[PDB]
Ligand SMILES: Cc1cc2nc3c(=O)[nH]c(=O)nc-3n(C[C@H](O)[C@H](O)[C@H](O)COP(=O)(O)OP(=O)(O)OC[C@H]3O[C@@H](n4cnc5c(N)ncnc54)[C@H](O)[C@@H]3O)c2cc1C
């Protein structure tokens with residue numbers, strides 16, 4: 001019985017930043033220490049935490065989805081894109097929490113709380129999904145799961161993918177379609193391709209990018225009908241379809257095309 005960090009979702013736990021790795025030009029993996037080397041976070045697969053801080057005089061609270069798990073003693077890993085100021089004309093101020101995190105020095109602390117979220121993966125194809133925050137979970141067990149992620153929307157998918165692949169008795173097959181702006185924006189590409197290499201029978205992997213490099217073997221553009229049809233399980237297998245990305249991605253690229261392909265709303269879930 002490892003000691004749990006997050007014992008009550010309303011309590012704040014200040015955690016110390018101990019390591020930070022560059023994922024790419026704007027994205028970073030931040031590692032924070034748990035209260036002791038023997039602690040686990042206490043995070044059901046599929047759920048996220050919230051960070052909070054007073055930034056420039058305002059309270060700022062933001063969700064982040066750990067990619068680590070309760071098998072990882074002593075630490076928690078977040079994968080976070082930094083939205084820099086002076087960069088995007090529509091957002092000259094950049095992002096509040098992400099730039100605050102980027103400015104943190106090793107040893108600095110920030111408050112975690114959680115876990116939260118309507119979906120919990122219970123292993124071996126079994127998902128517990130609440131219709132909303134005031135209702136009981138509906139327990140859905142499936143043979144396969146379609147996953148559509150855009151940018152940092154990869155993080156809840158990776159939690160689930162990792163949970164499945166770890167258990168040789170979990171025969172759930174994941175089909176992931178991962179969208180990013182450019183090839184260099186494909187976050188955690190080595191990790192994802194390692195997973196495909198090690199677990200090709202249970203993990204299908206495909207990419208699309210807004211703008212494709214010269215030699216490119218995957219897709220190009222926003223997520224469309226063809227990609228969904230060719231890279232997620234067919235509606236007949238009745239997979240669960242999970243989605244996580246920018247809201248217009250969900251609204252304009254995922255939902256209408258899931259419908260066109262024939263995936264019913266009951267089988268779809270947006271993180
Ligand atoms: C349930 C849930 C889980 C999430 N999990 C994660 C996660 O695991 N990892 C993660 O990185 N994010 C995750 N997100 C996003 C995260 O919560 C924040 O929204 C993100 O870090 C940006 O917050 P911010 O305070 O830095 O930006 P904000 O100050 O709140 O600014 C808002 C928006 O302005 C836009 N913007 C600002 N500057 C730029 C720029 N330079 N270029 C392009 N756009 C810009 C961005 O869209 C930005 O989100 C999750 C969101 C939800 C709802």
Ligand SMILES: NC(=O)c1ccc[n+]([C@@H]2O[C@H](COP(=O)([O-])OP(=O)(O)OC[C@H]3O[C@@H](n4cnc5c(N)ncnc54)[C@H](O)[C@@H]3O)[C@@H](O)[C@H]2O)c1
Pocket residue numbers: 048065081150151152153154155156179180181182209210221222223244245246247248249250252253270271
């Ligand atoms: N609810 C959750 O659990 C959760 C978890 C992680 C991330 N997220 C969200 O996912 C998003 C990730 O942001 P990002 O900066 O890394 O993404 P991004 O700006 O880099 O875009 C990533 C991909 O999203 C698609 N996209 C972007 N704009 C689109 C549009 N107008 N129409 C159709 N498709 C579009 C594109 O395919 C694009 O390549 C954020 O909104 C973040 O909040 C949510």
